[PDB]
Structures are given as C-alpha cells and as structure tokens.
Amino acid sequence: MKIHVRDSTLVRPSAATPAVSLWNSNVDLVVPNFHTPSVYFYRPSGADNFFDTAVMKAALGRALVSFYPMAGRLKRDEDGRVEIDCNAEGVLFVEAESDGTVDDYGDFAPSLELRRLIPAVDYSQGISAYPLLVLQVTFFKCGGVSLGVGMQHHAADGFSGLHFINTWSDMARGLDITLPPFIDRTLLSARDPPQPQFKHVEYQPPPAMKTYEPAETVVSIFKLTKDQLTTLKAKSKEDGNTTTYSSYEMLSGHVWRCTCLARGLPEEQETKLYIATDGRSRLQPQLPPGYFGNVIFTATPLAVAGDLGSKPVWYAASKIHDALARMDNDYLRSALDFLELQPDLKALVRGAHTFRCPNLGITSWVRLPIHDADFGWGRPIFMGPGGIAYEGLSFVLPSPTNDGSLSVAISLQAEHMKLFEKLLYQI
Template sequence: MVLDFTLYIYVQVTYFKCGGVSLGVGMEHRIADGVSGLHFVNTWSDIARGDLKHINPPFLDRTLLRARNPPQPAFPHIEFQPSPQMKLASDLLQSTTNATTSLFRLTQEQLNILKSKFKEDGGKNINTMKYTSFEILAGHIWRCACKARKLPDDQDTRLFIGIDGRSRLQPPLPPGFFGNAVFRAPQIAATGDLVSKPTWYATSCVHDALVRMDDDYLRSFLDYLELHLSSLSELVKPPLVGSVNLWINSWVRQLG
C-alpha cells in the first residue's frame, strides 16, 4: 500500500484464510502521540462492542499546549541544537551502514545484577534508592552503545528520552487529552566519562535529565518551538545513520 502523506489517519483491514481479521492503524504524529493513538483505538473498540458505559471522551482543546505570549524560553534546549560532530574513523563510519535489528530480553535477575553494581562504586556513598529501574537500564544501554560504536573518549554523545508531559505540566493535562504531548528529555556526556566512570554515573545522567522535565522546562520547550516555527522541520528531523546519539523510549507505564 502506498501511503498518502496528506492524510492524517490510515486504517487497513486484513482478512486471513483462517477466518481471522486484523486492523492496522497509522496516525500522523501531528494529530496524536502514542497515548492518544491508543485512546482512539480503544475507544473505537469499545463502541464496536457496544460498551458505551466506560468510554473516556477525548479532550480536544489544544490551546493547553500553546506557547506563552510572549514566548520566554528559559533553557538552552540542547535537544534542538546541532548534533555533536562525529569523530568516528572513516572505516567505522562506513560499517554503520550494515544495520541489523536485535531483541534483548532482560530478566529480573539480570536487572538486579545491574543494581548491585551500584554498591561497587569505589567506596562512594551513592543512594541507589533514588534511581528507578528504567534509569539504571537506560544508563547501562547508553554505556553499551558507546562501547559498541567504538566512540573515542572525547566524543560527546546525546541521549534523548521520550516522555509524556501530561502529568508533568502544571496543572496536568485533563484525562483523555487528545494530541501530541511527547517531549524530549535530553542529556549530553563525553563517551570517555560514560565508559570509564562507575556504573552509577550514566544512570545519574539519565536521572538528572528526567528530573529536569518539570513544568518550567516544558513551558520553555513550547516557547522555544514557537520562536523557531520557520525551521521546525530541521529541529525535529531524525538522526542520520551513524549518529553518536541515542533515543530511548519506554512504554511500560502506557501499556501496563
């Protein structure tokens, strides 16, 4: 099927010989993020079953995510700054074109081993209770990505974490808010620090990035975008192949 990118939603019904049916749905991200997309599909499913008692109607007022007047960004917003210059050797850069996809399943035991490494930090008194499992795992993945890419120690690398701003804004967005409320939580660090420092260092970088995403930062984020509407496509374009950066998303809370 050839997609028409002037449309905002796609629906494809597939009938199988066994009698089964699948429904595929595609949605333009300017209309809705993943949370709202699931809300749409689940509500549609409820209506199709005739279950109208538990429907949570969508909240369609997009003005809750508009910039202030006048816009007043208060942070540099490194998530929209040019990517750090790549310092990879030419042969390593060429090898990045041979991409593969892998799925890794981490058990609770393996996650506990990661957590236990915080106690082996060279004698420093680190309060591991303040770090979530996601922060520990994200920091570990960031370190491993730097090692696998064989990045030089002086190579800066950025981590971006997609976060749902609904509950972080003050006041929080109403239940059923329909739109795109995804923000980028950014962090930057030198590869040498991520790889050579104790395990807790990368995790603390992740933690600091997430803690920063409060109402002040998110409002500043919206103001920054308002001031750069003419170059918006450049600000949000995906990274190039061979990028030294990393994107991490977690759907645990949305799907759990």
C-alpha cells in the same frame, strides 16, 4: 510474502461530530510528516468470528465520534500553519490477506517488513490528500491476524494514539468509553510574548563522528527477564553509591552504555541520548484527562563515551535522572516559547542524522497499556513499532505476559549488533 488487499473503505464517525478547524500547538507541529507505524499480532482464539471486520469497523465508527479529529484531514490556515480540518471524511480501513504466517515474523524484531502490514500513504499529492489514520487487518494463512496502524503525528502522540486504539477495542467488546478525550490544544499555546528561559539543549546539534562510512542497519530485539532487571537495578550500589535510580533509569543508562561500547566509540567521543518524555505528567495546571494531541518533550543527557564505559551504570542513570528532573512546568513552558520563536519548526524534526552513531534515542513503552487492545478475541501476543526507521533508535517493550520481562528493540549497524547483545546481557 505475498499480500493481497480484499477491500478498503473509508470509515466515518457513526454519528454527527463537530465541523471545526482544530489548532495545532507547537508540540503538534514539531513532528514527522509521516504516519507513525505500529503493529499488533493476534493468535486464533478458536472463535468463529475471529476479527470479524464488520465488528471492527462498527466499533471504529463509534470510537471516531469521540475521537473525531482522527477522521479529519490536514489543511493550512491563512498564515500557512497546519491545522486539522475536522471534516469527518473518514479513516482508511483495509482488509488484507497474506500467504505467510505469524510465525514467519519470529521474535517480531521490528524490521521494515512490518511496514507491509500498514497501508501505504502517498505523500506526493499534498497534505490534504490522505487520511490521518490508516488501518489494516491482515489475515494470515495460519489463522493469525495483524492490526497495522498508521497515525499522522499532527493528530496525536503515542499516548493519545493508544487511548484511541484501546477505546476502539473496548467498543468492539461492547463497552462504553472509559475516558472521554479532551480536545483543545490551545492549552499548550506559547506565552505572549514568548519568554524562553534556555537555549534549549534538546534542539541543539548533537555530537558528530568526524568520519562516516556507510552502514546498513539491522533491527534486533532482546528479552531481559525480571531477574535480570532486578539484578541490574541493584547495581546502583556499585562503588559504594547510595542514591537509588529507577528501573527505567538504570535500564536506559545500561542500553546507552552498551550502545557506546558496541559501537567502539573513542574514549573521548561525546554522545547524546534522546529520551521522549510526556508533559502530561509535569505541566501545570494539570492538563485535563484524555487530552488529545501531542505533549511529548525531549530530555537529552550528554556524556563522554569513555566515562560511560569506565563507570557503573548508575553514572549513566544519574545523567538520565537529572535530564528528566529539570523538565518541570517552567522548563516545558520555556520549550513552548522557544519553539514559538523558531523560524521553521519542521527544521527541528529529528531524522536519521540525529540518531546516527554516536547518539541514540530510547523510547520506553514499559509503563503503557499497549497490550490492552483486546477486540473480543484476546490480547495481542505482540505489539510494537511498525519498523524502526534508522540506526540508533531503540524501544523498550513490556511483556504481554505478567512475567515481568521486557524487550529491547534496537537498530544498529550489523557489525555493532553482536557486541551489543553480548554487553546487554552482562548484568
């Protein structure tokens, strides 16, 4: 596929905004130095102004008035802590055309081909050189469009990112803002003095394999029907168990169990699962609605591969449930204090090393309004991560339709992926 840039421009807020330095909490700092990628695809609606970029950019400028740190730059304070200079220098907006088609992406498995639909960022010129948000509208030969989004993680987590994109699309459709963002991350300050309660399992080194060989990773995506999910949830009754687990818990346990078997892990091999969890739900007092920043904490259940394999899915689901249950306000506040006492927070950012065999990360977007980004020409037919970076990461994506199906997108070694698919459908 050939992609050709027609125009690129910095879009600034359409009205005055505060000229301030925005503090980053410890949760805003334990994030990649990258732009988190996501992509939206849209089919032609028949309209004559399909994804008119003037409509797009005007609505973007309005949205940036309320989300003004999105238009800022990173800088460091005197002590070297990264903060957001809310200088309204603007967001990058790229209009692109492609000699390919939306059909060329098939089932939209989030391979690294999607990265071409998001603007590239040069990280070699220091942290202030690039915008915090980079956007690309690509016009395909077939008439379809992709919106590619690259969001610098210090500014916001997925929840705030979605808040922004859906606000933007509302404004493109002529609406006013539904949920004003709340901008003040000092609500997530550590206690003084920091008083950690635990040696937080989520920042400890994961189990290892004892040998490594090299592995290319493939990315696939698999749909599970409503019927299949219902059947899966009902397996909680297996072996006379009477505790019920949620569909989320049962599916994540199922994926975990399937990954272990697909990878042929030895029976005694330990495995750690990393589950992102939104603290907005648990922190006390309630964070204001529309809180703008990062509030993602990690639940990390542990198991033995042989036990996951030889026991019902609800065994894995129970581990997941317990690991999530313990993350109440006290535990989240503990984690903030734990971070405060770390000497180097970027050392805690998880990479490919974290999610290699035997471990796994599962991110669920099933609860989230990811398809509400209707800019006036319809909801997307697909929304996903813009390329799963490495082996051992998975995303659970709700259907764009109301058929109650979902998709598991996952990155595995190629020899593992085929067994994985077979096991996933043994419901």
